[PDB]
């Protein structure tokens, strides 16, 4: 029930160069759920691309 987040900023070719930034402990989630990724592009314009 801790949701630990590690970030690799993409300044290096190293895949595992992960940095902890934030987490929420005692996290309550549905026991079963759907994973999904959503992205929006409003007034400004960013390309949202997921490779893997």
């Amino acid at each position: 029930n801790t949701l630990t987040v590690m970030i690799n900023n993409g300044f290096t070719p190293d895949k595992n160069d992960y940095e902890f930034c934030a987490k929420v402990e005692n996290m309550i989630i549905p026991a079963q759920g759907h994973f999904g990724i959503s992205a929006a592009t409003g007034g400004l314009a960013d390309d949202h691309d997921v490779l893997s």
């Binding site: 900023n9 300044f11 290096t12 940095e19």
Partner: protein, 52 residues
């Protein structure tokens, strides 16, 4: 050369550790956090709490 800096590194030395500035003390880094602290509009403020 690891793109980590400007970083903020906690290193506690008992008196027996040489600080490797060439690796910026990455090996003996007890902790590190990634924030920039240069050229800010207002002065940067730091709270350091030793507590238990």
């Amino acid at each position: 050369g690891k793109k980590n800096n400007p970083a903020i590194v906690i290193i506690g030395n008992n008196g027996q550790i040489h600080y490797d500035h060439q690796n910026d003390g990455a090996s003996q880094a007890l902790a590190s956090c990634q924030r920039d602290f240069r050229n800010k509009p207002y002065p940067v403020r730091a709270k350091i709490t030793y507590y238990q």
